[model samples]
Every structure is written in C-alpha cells, then in structure tokens.
Target chain A: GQFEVLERHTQWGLDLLDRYVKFVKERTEVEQAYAKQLRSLVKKYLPKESKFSQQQSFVQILQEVNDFAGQRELVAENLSVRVCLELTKYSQEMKQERKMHFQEGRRAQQQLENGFKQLENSKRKFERDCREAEKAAQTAERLDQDINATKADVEKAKQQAHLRSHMAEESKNEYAAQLQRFNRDQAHFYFSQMPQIFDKLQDMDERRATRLGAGYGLLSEAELEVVPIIAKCLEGMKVAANAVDPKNDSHVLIELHKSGFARPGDVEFEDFS
Target chain B: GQFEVLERHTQWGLDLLDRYVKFVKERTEVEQAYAKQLRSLVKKYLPKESKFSQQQSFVQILQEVNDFAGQRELVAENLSVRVCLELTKYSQEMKQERKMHFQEGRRAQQQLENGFKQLENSKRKFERDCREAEKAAQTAERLDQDINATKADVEKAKQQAHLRSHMAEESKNEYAAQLQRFNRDQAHFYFSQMPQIFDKLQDMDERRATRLGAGYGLLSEAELEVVPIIAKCLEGMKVAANAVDPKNDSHVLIELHKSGFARPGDVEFEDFS
Candidate 1:
C-alpha cells in the first residue's frame, strides 16, 4: 500500500515530462517549417527586374522578409538544443531516482515482513508447548487423586509435569521478547524509514516540476532573444516599402527611351515640276 | 520627325505601366503564397494534446500565428484588386489615346504634303511656258532682221511672238500667287497644327506618369493599411507567449496526480503466534 504512492507519483512525473517535451518538439518544428516555406515563397515571387527604383525597393523588402524568417529559425534552434534537450535529460534523471527509491522502499518493506514470519513461528511453538504442559499437569493431578496408581510412577509423572511447565514458561518469555523486538523494528520501519524514502521521492517530484517550469520560461526567453531582431526586420521591410520612388523611375523611363528625332523643317515651293 | 517624341513618350508610358503591374502582381502572389504555407505549417506542427496548462498556452499562440497569416492574405487580396486592376485599365486607355493622336497627326501631315505637291506642279508649268515664249520671240527677231525675207511673213511672226510672251507672263503671275499661298499654308500647318497634337500627347504622358506615381503610393498605402492589424497580431502572439505559467501547470500536475495511499500502520506484536 505504501509503494502505491511511489508507483503513482513516479509514473505521473514521467507523464508530465512527456507532455512538456512533446510541446517543445512540436513548437520548434513549426518554427523551422515556417522559416523554410517563407524563404521558398520569396524566391518564387520576387521580381526579376532590378533596373527600376520600384524593383530595387521590392528586392529590399523581400530580403527583409528572408531575414524575418531567419529569426524564427534562430528561436527554433535555440529551443530545441537548450530547452528540449535539457527537459529530456531531466526526465531520465527523475526516472533513475524514482527507480532507486522504489527499490529501497520495497527492500525495507520485505525485510520487515520476513521478520514478521519468524515472530509468528516462535509464537506458534510457544503456544503449543504451553498446551502440552497443561495436559501433563492435569494428568498428574488425576493420578495423585487415584489410590490404584503406583506412588513412584505418580511422583515421577508429577515431577515431569513440573519440568514441562518450567520449560513452557521459558519458551513463552522468549516468544514475548522476540515479539517486542519485532514491534520496535516494525514501528521504526513504517514511521521513519518509509517516510524518508517518500520524502526523497516527493523532493525529486518537486525538483522535476520546478525544472520543467524553468524549461517553459526558457522557451519564452529564447523567443524573446530574437524579438529585437524581429522588430528590426519588420521595420526594415517598412523602410524598404517607403523607399520606392516611382516618379524617379518614371523620369528615368522617359530619359532612357526618348527618341532623338528633330522636328520637320519648312518646305519651300520646288521650282522643277 | 514630329511624331518621334509622341511615339517615344507613348511607348515609355506603356513600359512603366508594365513594370508596375508586374511588380504588384508578383508581390501579391508572394503574399498569398506566404499565408497559405504558414497555415499549412501550423496544421502540421501544432500540438495534438490539449490537457495541460502549457499545451493550452501553445494552442493560443498557434491560433495567433494563423491570424497573422490571415492578415497577409487580406493585404494580398486588397492590392491585387485595387491597385493592379486600375493600373492595367490605365495602360489600355493610354494606348488607345496614343493611337488616335498618331492617326490625327499623320492625316494632317499627309494633307500638308499634298498641298506642297500641287504648288510644285504649278511652278513647273510656268517655267516651261516662259522657255517656250523665249524661243518664239527669238524666231520672230530672226525673220525681221533678214532683208530678203517677206514683209508679210515677218509682221505675222512678230505678232505671234508678242502673243506668246503675254501668255507666259500670265502663267508666271498665276504661279507666283500659288507659291505665296503655299508658304502661308505650310507655315500654319507646321507651326500651329503639329504642336497642338504634341501638346495633347505630352499632357497624356504627364498624366500617365502622375497616375503611375499615385499607383506606387497606393501600393505602399495598401501595406500600410494592414500595419496596425499586423502590430496587433504580433502583440497578440507576444502576449500569448507571456501567458505561459509553467509553474501553474507544474502545481496542477502534482495536485491532480497525487496517489491516495495512507502510510502503513505500525506492526503490533501478535500474541497468537
């Protein structure tokens, strides 16, 4: 019954560990995937033309977007290596600790049970001897009351009964002393040793929980580490959008494509037909 | 020569139009593609488990990320329909306008060339008549100067010569008058008519450039329209990240999973061994 708590607590710790590690694993995968697809998108849709102002600005914007993707990838990498890896390590340590605690608890419990078996055998032997002593004493009393019984035989039987009673008393005292020792040891095992094991298991559980919480905070902190760069990339995109000078491009279009043709000169009347 | 400026300006307008439309087209496609892939990534990597505190917070974060994808899709749709469609329509209108102006300019030019052709024909006829008159007068002078020649024949030839000179003078005056009229008409056609057509063409080019600039501004404006929502979505994600309370989850796990075993009672010494 005492082992049940340890059994349940140990499994529950493992279950919680599994849940947290799964969360981190999935989150990081999404981050890495998002970065991959965003880069692919940029490659597919960025304009080929780079000679114009608008085109230049668009290229800049896409570059910023690519950098934005890098931020997500960075966070993903950090979380996977730092937080997820540690969580897995902690899980292994907790299981090892729980196994040792369980083994110690069970061994202490088994030793006490074996001691109980020894005490029960001693008590049974002592009780059986007591009954034998009673029978012998009763038989001797009956023999003395009868005149037909021989004097020497009756005396001998009475002496035998007395000897048996003394031996039974000695066995009874020995059983009582053994039982007393068992009780003290059993009490100490239940009240002190078991609880010490329970306390260690509970402490391990608390430490796992605390460290798991720390892992959670670390996940957020990893993302936070990239936040400044993310903001800058977003701002850079905004700046790139603003950098478009369509009017300048328009003027350049005109300047580059203007055909060099002079206006038609005046026509005089031709004298020859 | 006069149509060269018009031709260059017209085609330049079309080229700018093509560049801008292509840019918007590609940008919107990228935006749309980015959103689609983001949603797909979310689906692939979001945690399936929802029983824990950390899991719940993670679900919230993924939901926010999906909404961020929606914002990109929204901006893509808006730009594709609003700016791109209008620019395309303007391109067609500019082409139509340029075609009509060229036809009008060419027709006026053809009419002026034909008028010069008629003036040249008149001047050639007058010059031929003057040469014929000189030949006729010289023949009449030769007949009069010969002493042996018939007086009647000489007098008749001089009368014929005088009539031919008068005819030539009449044709010369008519040619001179025609030349004067041609000069006036040519000056008017070149100075007045051509510039009018060019003025309209230049105005159209200016309008196209100005409208194209506006389109460029609109592209920026379209993205700007979504900026506030983007900021909100980003902030929403940030808030979601902060909402994680791993400690709370840890505490809950402990509370929920506590085993229900009481400590074993101390062993009593069994009297009946």
Candidate 2:
C-alpha cells in the first residue's frame, strides 16, 4: 500500500511535467504555423500599388495580436502557480485527515474491548444483584455499539481523504500539462517568427532613412542656386558702404544706384586725376 | 441683358477652369516628386532580410491610403457635376427675379408720369371747382405714396436676388477650389507613393516566401520521408509488374517479407532444364 501511494505520487509528478512539456511543444508549433501562414497571405494579395500608410496599418494590427498573445502567457503563468499551490495544500490536508482517521480507529477498537471486559464483570455479579448487573450489562452493550459506529466513521474518513488526494493530483497534472502545451505552441507559432520580422523591419528602416536623406539632399541641391544668390545680395547690402573701396569707382557707382541717388543723366564723370 | 449675363457666366467658368488647370499641374508635379522619393525609400529600406515586420506593416498601411486617394479622384468628379447643376439653378433664379424687378420699376415710372399728368389736370379743374377739387388732389397724393412704396419694395427684391446670386457663386467656387486642393494634396501625399509600396511588397513577399519555402521544404523532407518513399515505391512496383511474362503457362510467386524476402536457408530450389 505504501509503495502504491508513493508510486502514485511519483506518477502524478511525472504526469504534470509531461503535461507542461507537451503544452509548450504544441504551443510553439501552432504559433510558428500561424505566423508562417499569415506572412504568406499578406504577400499573396498585397496590392501592387499600396502605400506605406496601408502597410503600417497592417503591421500595427499584427503587433497588437502579438501583444495580446504575450499578455495571455502572463495570465497563464499566474494561474499555473496558483494551481500548484492549491494541489500542495490539498495533499497536505488529506495526509493529516488520513492520520487522524487511523488514530480514531485504534481508539475505537480499544474501547470495544474494554466494554466487553465490563460486560464480563457484570455477568459475575448478576447472581448477587440482578438489577445492578442488568443495568451495567446494558451500559457496556451501548458502549460497544458506539465504538463500532465510530470505527466505521473513521474508515469512511480515510477513504474520503484518499479519494480527495487522488482527485487533486489528477487535476493538477492535467492543468500543468495543458499550460505547458499552450505555452510551447504559442512560442512556436508567433514568438519564434518575431525575430525574423524585426530583422526585416530594421533593414527596411535603414534603407528608407538613407533614401530619404538622399531625396532631401537632392531637394536642397535643386534650391541651392536661388538661395545662394539671395544670400549674397543680402550680404552685399549689409556691408555695402564699409566694404566698398573708394579707390574702386565702380563700387561707388553701385552704392549710388542702391540709394536711388542717380538719375538717368545726373552724373557723367569720366575724369581721372 | 441676356448677352451680358452670358458673358459674366462665361468669364466665371473660364476662371474656374484656369484655376483647376493650374491646381492639377502643380499637384501632379508634387505627386511625381513624392513617388520618386517613395521609390527610393523602398529600394533602400526593403532589403533581403525578413525581420522588419513593422516596416512591412507601415508599407501596407501606406498602400491602403493610396487606394483611398485614387478613389477620392472619382468623388471629386462627381462633386463637379453637382456643383454645375447647383450653379445653373442659382443663375436662373437670379435672372427671373431681375425680370420681375425690372417690370415693377417700369410700372412705377409710368405711374409717376401719369401722376404728373393727373396733377396738371387736377390744378386746371381746381380753378373751376375750388373746394371739391381738394379731395381729388388728396387721392392723387395717396396714390403717389403707394407707387413709391411699390418701387422701393421692387428695388429691395432685386438687390436681395443679386446678393443671393453672388453668395452662391462665391460659395460654390470656394468649395470647388478647396476640394480640388484637398484631393490633389491627398493624391500627392498618399496615393502617388502607392506604386512604390506595391513594388516593395512584391519584392519583400517574394524574398520572404522563397526563404520560408526553403526552410519548410528542408524540414518536410526530413520529417516526411515516408511521403517521398511511397511515391517512389509506387512507381517502382508498376515497373516491376510490367517486366513479368504475359500469358505463359508459368506463374510467378510473390512473397512479402520484412526486408527484401526469401533467404537461401530452409528451402530447396529446383532448376528447370
């Protein structure tokens, strides 16, 4: 019986572990398959003229799904821990109940024996005091009956405890197995594919940034000619008086034109000293 | 008056057409420029790796936006037809109100000339019939007041109609111009980049599918050896059967064994001469 109990417990533990392992395996596989299929479908019907905005929207939806899966895993993990703790507590309680039932059974058997001895003593005294002997014998008889009932109740308690233990073990093992399977499947189906997706995204971003920079450069170049001329003219006006050499007569002529001092034929100086 | 109305309408129509032409030209140029930028972006970021799912998602979102833009153009065309109908109705109402007001104005002028004639006649009569003529003059004055009020009311109606016509024309033109600008910007900002996104999606899908296919095929070959073997064996069996002699008195015995079949042990073979 002891070996059987030990073996049962061992088997339950192994069963729980097996359940978890299977869950993880299946979960991973399912996730991987889902990711693969989703990627393919996106590729197949993708519009030939779709813009970045549309693509980003699709990606956002996909990421949201991923986030949901991650959250579910966290919830599952918490449930698993609670289940394990409950099983342990139940197992301990069952053990204590069984032990108490065993002690009660022994006490009941001793009481029954003591009641029989009292009955024997009362029989010996029956000849001397008939009424007293009769009363004593009835008392012993009642005690015997009470002990038998107590023994039966204890036996029932033992069985109930055993059954409870068995059930608790089974339930825990099943739950663990399920969680393990789901976790594995989830990892396989979705998480495993995430690395590949990230790689692609990085590649896309780097390439796009480079191209955007090139475009910005081209635009800058296109506008450079007009911008520089405006800047140079502004610079010339800023320092027109100080920068102009009086020895350079052309400079003086340019300043006069800017100040609007020169009329069509107001100045005709061709003399040089 | 009809020629004048026609000229005004024609002028407005031509002006609208000119503005639309300019808008379309500028919008198309911007769209083309943006498309080029998007193409470069695609070529740069959309690389050989499949890890970048976010970028891929972004691209898909952009494609959807582009589709919306393309559809928006059709909406604009429908809006144009509605605007034209509204404008025509407004102009006709203005013309009818103007005619009514003109008729009222002509009546007022005739009444004024008649009053002058009546006043002169009244004066001549008054000299002959003195005290009784005063009542006739009072009646003529009242008639003049009524005619003046009628003329003012008609003038007010004409102004109101003119204002309604101006407001309708202005509102319609503004709405059309605004809608045109919005559609053009939407096309340029969103739809024009779609072709590039589509190109990227195509390329990305192809690369990803090929890579995934290679991986899946390898795994399937390893895990599903039975499938290939069965296919090969079916063909081999058909070939073996064809090699058997046809219609002779000799029969061939077929044996199924664990490996290839009969060994030399525990059997005696006779050779036919």
| Top candidate when judged by DockQ against the true structure | 1
Q: What is candidate 2's CA lDDT for residue A31?
A: 35
First chain TM-score in every candidate?
Answer: 0.89, 0.26
Best by TM-score: 1
For each of the candidates, give the backbone clash count.
0, 50
Question: Candidates' DockQ values?
Answer: 0.17, 0.01
Candidate 2 deviant stretches above 4 angstroms: A1-273, B1-59, B71-75, B122-273
Q: For candidate 1, write residues A1-273 as lDDT tens digits.
A: 546744774577577667667767876886676688778767765664356555565577667777878888898899898878878887888889888988998899889899888788778888888888888989999999989999987999899899988888888887888788788888798788887987787677667766655665565577568868876776666666556665565466545555643445555544432
Backbone clash pairs for candidate 1 read none
TM-score of chain B of each: 0.87, 0.25
Q: What's the CA error at residue A144 for candidate 2, in Å?
A: 99
State the lDDT of candidate 2 residue by residue for A1-273, as single tens digits.
Answer: 222232233233233323323333333333344334434433433333112222222233333323433433443343333333333454354445434543553454455446445444433333234343344445544554675657655555555555544554454444445444544443443343333433333343333333322222222132232434433432332232232221232223234334542222211211111
Q: CAPRI verdict on model 1?
A: incorrect
